[PDB]
């Protein structure tokens, strides 16, 4: 009942501006994709883009993600409809944020988009076998190539988790939709 968001992230869009919370705890997250709109146990979203991303975060020791596909402006709200903020698109050029070529700067994951299909990507420790390590909710871990648990428009219908860790902690959330 008492929910509030959607899930564990919980996001909310306000007219231009949509706020996410953390569930990673509540004491000192760390945000990546952007800390420019990252609060703390929270993510101020504004001026997003129509697009998609990879949100990390990061509480202590606990790790949460999930992918952020939406365009802002007209969707959800609290408790608002009259109001003239934000300016209509004012400086942006371009971003991008991550974009895979990692290898120097920490790390970053994200989902491909194929054939009517939705790949993903991991964080390797060595080099051998191990290769992207994905462990779902429900499923162990299973190395492979590519990250393929789910479809275009099959979504993979269940929440996965990746790091470079036979019990990964960062659980990437799947909810996409145009």
Not at 55 to 77: P, R
Not at 101 to 109: A, E, P, T
Not at 115 to 132: A, I, P
Request: net charge negative.
């Amino acid at each position: 009942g008492s929910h509030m968001g959607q899930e564990e992230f919980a996001v909310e869009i306000s007219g231009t501006t949509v706020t996410i919370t953390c569930p990673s705890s509540g004491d000192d997250i760390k945000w990546k994709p952007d800390p420019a709109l990252g609060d703390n146990n929270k993510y101020i979203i504004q001026n997003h883009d129509s697009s998609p991303l990879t949100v990390s975060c990061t509480a202590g020791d606990q790790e949460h993600t999930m992918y952020l596909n939406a365009k802002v402006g007209s969707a959800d709200d609290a408790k608002k409809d009259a109001a003239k903020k934000d300016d209509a698109k004012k400086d942006d050029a371009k971003k991008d944020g991550s974009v895979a070529k990692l290898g120097v700067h920490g790390l970053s994951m994200s989902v491909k988009e194929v054939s009517g299909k939705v790949f993903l990507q991991c964080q390797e420790s060595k080099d051998l076998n191990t290769n992207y390590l994905w462990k779902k909710g429900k499923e162990e871990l299973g190395n492979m190539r590519q990250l393929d648990l789910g479809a275009i428009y099959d979504d993979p219908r269940g929440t996965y988790t990746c790091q470079r860790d036979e019990n990964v902690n960062s659980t990437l959330h799947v909810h996409y939709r145009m």
